[PDB]
Design a protein around this ligand. Structure first.
Ligand SMILES: Nc1nc2c(ncn2[C@@H]2O[C@H](COP(=O)(O)OP(=O)(O)O)[C@@H](O)[C@H]2O)c(=O)[nH]1
Length: 615
């Protein structure tokens, strides 16, 4: 750190660590930080490479977070529990890692655990993920006796003298392993051969290739998404972490290896953005932490150019200008202030005030391109009611704390009526008198609201119109079917009457309200429900029970498609049916299934559903 720090785009390693709950994602992160060393983004150094560890969403399912996290990072280290082989979230992260094309390597953690087995991992990877693993190391001892590791690419072994990580020594491959080892070396050379003509010829000739040669070939296959080097160890016992770190520099990609980010031009034509430090700056904000003692920290990833300390940058997705006060780099133990952050690098910036997650930041006379609160797409309303995306983009609303998820219904009429509101009273408040006659009528779906005043000859005193409208306005917030907002109607005030001294503003507000409660009740009202658009990812083995579930959930299948080794089914299913789904889709596809849905349209609840809802 600091002393003799080097840059180079080629020496950068922006990685993420993906894993199923309990696989050991954090414990390996802790160890990695502990080893390199002697926040949305922590940085460290290993063999002259800056490794930036981007923190990944713990809830492997929150697409917005997962989607974005895959864009800021360049390589992933998928961690497996060596006694479970591929697991649910692992498969999910896997498909995720593909829909975004992020090179990866795997780490079979927990080799010390009772039940641990490298082959269980390799096989399940091969079958569920449909991944081509490459065995790069072989264990020595097993379970309670695991205690060394064999580098089959280099044919070297390492033994660990304690569970503390303070005793490591290179040793000769034990005789009892020399052949399994010789076997895997060849399998590996064989694979490398698929990526370098030169290695095949030598393989064929019985010549042993150079480790530089092999490494490169595997690195190439890996960056190409062809193979998936597999490593193993025990984060908890301090066996294998350094070897894992060497692999990150050897095979994960640099910002130069992966392909250009693309963002849309100010007019609309998407252009690709190469990581050139000397070209227009363009950065993307991916996380906004509020430091308990430095304040709003904005974490960014720089795609092009150089962001310099104390400069003016332009947030293009907000049109605002911002001032970059300081630039920071989080480390294991400690922060470091920097003067600049060049392309392909990441850090935190102090000084932004209107920049929220997902915002693009181009500089001075840099072209305005768009690359895409902490946020979660929420919205507060009112007794609180925190509407949200799931469980326009906010059709499921919970209220306060206890209040269970409710589906945002709406109501309307189908037949135009011509009603009449009337208020007559002898309240303490003198004599109240209001009387309006209106014509309500249906408007095309989504047309909103339209109020027309058609009163002639001051039949209703001009000072009261605003009040009949405030009345109408209020009544509409709670239709008489199930009590949800009334929409898509056009009301025309066309007659009524008043009393010279009895009329009043409230008398006319009430009568506005009433005329409307009737209008809706008498215009053959309907309930409109949100129709979500879902995308269920199912291993084609289960692709029959699933579709069936959809159709039972008043769904309507659109199309199929393949996500490599799985099938993705698009459909429109009432959000009211999609309740609990996740819990019953796991069951339907043995946890190996996952969907994501987006509000699509509003449409009328079928008479039947209506009668149910109504009661
Ligand atoms: N035996 C053993 N347990 C491990 C190992 N790595 C992680 N664990 C245990 O797995 C549990 C959860 O892992 P953890 O890193 O803490 O969080 P995570 O990503 O959700 O897994 C903890 O009890 C760890 O102590 C390992 O190498 N060996």
């Amino acid at each position: 750190m600091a002393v003799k720090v080097e840059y180079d785009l080629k020496r950068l390693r922006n990685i993420g660590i993906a894993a199923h709950i309990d696989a050991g994602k954090t414990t390996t992160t802790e160890r990695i930080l502990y080893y390199t060393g002697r926040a949305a983004v922590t940085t460290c150094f290993w063999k002259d490479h800056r490794i930036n560890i981007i923190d990944t969403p713990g809830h492997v399912d929150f697409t917005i977070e997962v989607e974005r996290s895959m864009r800021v990072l360049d390589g992933a280290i998928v961690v497996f529990d060596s006694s479970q082989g591929v697991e649910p979230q692992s498969e999910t992260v896997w498909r995720q890692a593909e829909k975004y094309k992020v090179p990866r390597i795997a780490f079979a953690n927990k080799m010390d655990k009772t039940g641990a087995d490298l082959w269980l991992v390799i096989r399940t990877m091969q079958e569920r993920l449909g991944a081509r693993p490459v065995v790069m190391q072989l264990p020595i001892g097993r379970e309670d006796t695991f205690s060394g590791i064999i580098d089959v690419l280099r044919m070297k072994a390492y033994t660990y003298g304690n569970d503390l990580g303070t005793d490591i020594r290179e040793i000769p491959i034990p005789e009892e392993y020399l052949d399994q080892a010789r076997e895997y070396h060849e399998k590996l050379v064989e694979v490398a051969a698929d990526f370098d003509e030169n290695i095949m010829l030598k393989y064929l000739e019985g010549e042993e290739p150079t480790e530089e040669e092999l490494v490169a070939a595997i690195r190439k296959g890996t960056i190409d998404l062809k193979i998936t080097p597999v490593f193993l160890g025990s984060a908890l016992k301090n066996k294998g972490v350094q070897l894992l770190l060497d692999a990150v520099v050897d095979y994960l990609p640099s910002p130069l290896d992966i392909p250009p980010i693309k963002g849309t031009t100010p007019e609309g034509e998407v252009v690709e953005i190469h990581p050139d430090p000397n070209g227009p700056l363009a950065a993307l904000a991916f996380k906004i932490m509020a430091d308990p003692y430095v304040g709003r920290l904005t974490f960014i990833r720089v795609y092009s150019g150089t962001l310099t300390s104390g400069s003016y940058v332009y947030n293009t997705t907000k049109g605002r200008k911002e001032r970059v006060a300081r630039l920071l780099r989080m480390h294991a133990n400690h922060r470091e202030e920097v003067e600049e952050l060049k392309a392909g690098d990441l850090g935190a910036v102090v000084g932004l005030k209107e920049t929220i997650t997902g915002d693009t930041l181009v500089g001075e006379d840099a072209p305005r391109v768009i690359l895409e609160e902490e946020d979660p797409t929420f919205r507060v309303s009112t007794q609180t009611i925190i509407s949200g995306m799931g469980e326009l983009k906010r059709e499921f609303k919970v209220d306060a704390n206890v209040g269970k998820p409710q589906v945002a219904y709406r109501e309307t009429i189908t037949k135009p009526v011509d009603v009449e509101g009337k208020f007559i009273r002898q309240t303490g408040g003198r004599g109240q008198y209001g009387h309006v006659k209106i014509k309500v009528e249906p408007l095309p779906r989504g047309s909103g609201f339209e109020f027309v005043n058609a009163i002639v000859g001051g039949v209703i005193p001009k000072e009261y119109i605003p009040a009949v409208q405030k009345g109408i306005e209020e009544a509409m917030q709670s239709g008489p079917l199930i009590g949800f907002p009334v929409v898509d109607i056009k009301v025309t005030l066309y007659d009524g009457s008043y009393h010279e001294v009895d009329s009043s503003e409230m008398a006319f507000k009430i009568a506005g309200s009433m005329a409307i409660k009737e209008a809706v009740q008498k215009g053959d009202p309907v309930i409109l429900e949100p129709i979500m658009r879902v995308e269920v990812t199912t291993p084609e083995e289960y692709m029959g029970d699933v579709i069936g579930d959809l159709n039972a959930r008043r769904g309507q299948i659109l199309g199929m498609e393949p996500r490599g080794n799985a099938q993705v089914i698009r459909a429109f299913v009432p959000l009211a049916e999609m309740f609990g789904y996740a819990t019953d889709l796991r069951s339907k596809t043995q946890g190996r299934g996952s969907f994501v849905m987006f509000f699509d349209h509003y449409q009328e609840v079928p008479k039947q559903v209506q009668e149910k809802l109504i009661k």
